[PDB]
Ligand binder design. Structure first.
Ligand SMILES: Cc1c(Nc2ccccc2C(=O)O)cccc1[N+](=O)[O-]
Length: 264
């Protein structure tokens, strides 16, 4: 219960099929609020907050521990194990997509399916590989994030949301601004330093790759990369949704696509 309490674990819904909804960067579990009504009636929905979420006591964010994705996988597995979940479908936005991938390699039996939203195994460019970002441009962003966090949020949130959906821009900004600035920077460094390309072939559960248009964080070719390199049966859903946070900006359409992927 103490981790379950610390990370605001919530189990809701009247169904028996277990569905884990795992928020990503800059949000908390409330990013799923508008998706939830579409699943509460026929799934048992598990939600939690990543340790870096603005909604979690920043005392739990231990900079000596959370230096890679692996301790975040530990937290997810502990939660699922504590709850007695021996199989689930798992939806991971942003960094939670990579967390779910790693968890699935550790525990191949735990996941029936992974649904990946706004996922990338690597943000940085490399030889054969377009991640979308150059090392140099990214140091400039880290400097701005350190120099003026509130301003960085206000410039970043419209790019992340992408589509002109002011309510979703304000909502993402709200949860980014709830994160302690040095946590946000450290998490961002952690993930820009991450490269999951080498482990994708180890995954054996089926993955549904949800890819929006003009995703600031994820070039189209990255979705194709995941499809070609994840080791199990993969399916790309090319969503008629613009931007990196489709659960915030287009929830109805996102929820219908999720239901389709789950029923596949
Ligand atoms: C894209 C980005 C992010 N994004 C992340 C960082 C960590 C985990 C997930 C993300 C994510 O976008 O899903 C953070 C800071 C700066 C920038 N940027 O555009 O320079």
């Amino acid at each position: 219960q103490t981790l379950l309490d610390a990370l605001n674990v919530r189990v809701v819904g009247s169904g028996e099929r277990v569905l884990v909804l795992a928020h990503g960067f800059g949000t908390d579990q409330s990013a799923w609020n508008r998706i939830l009504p579409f699943f509460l009636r026929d799934y048992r929905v598990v939600l939690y907050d990543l340790v870096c979420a603005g909604s979690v006591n920043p005392d739990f964010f231990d900079f000596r521990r959370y230096t890679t994705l692996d301790p975040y996988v530990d937290d997810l597995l502990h939660i699922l194990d504590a709850l007695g979940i021996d199989q689930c479908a798992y939806v991971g936005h942003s960094v939670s997509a990579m967390i779910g991938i790693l968890a699935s390699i550790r525990r191949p039996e735990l996941f029936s399916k992974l649904i990946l939203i706004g996922a990338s195994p690597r943000f940085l460019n490399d030889e054969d590989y377009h991640g979308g970002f150059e090392q140099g441009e990214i140091e400039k962003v880290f400097s701005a994030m350190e120099a003026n966090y509130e301003a960085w949020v206000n410039g970043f949130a419209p790019l992340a949301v992408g589509a002109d959906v002011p309510a979703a821009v304000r909502e993402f900004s709200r949860t980014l601004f709830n994160m302690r600035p040095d946590i946000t920077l450290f998490v961002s460094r952690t993930v820009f330093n991450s490269d999951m390309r080498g482990v994708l072939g180890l995954v054996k559960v089926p993955c549904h790759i949800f890819q929006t248009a003009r995703d600031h964080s994820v070039p189209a070719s990255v979705a194709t990369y995941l499809k070609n390199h994840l080791g199990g049966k993969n399916t790309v859903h090319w969503l008629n949704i613009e931007g990196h946070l489709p659960h915030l900006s287009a929830p109805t359409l996102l929820a219908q696509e999720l239901r389709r992927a789950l029923s596949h």
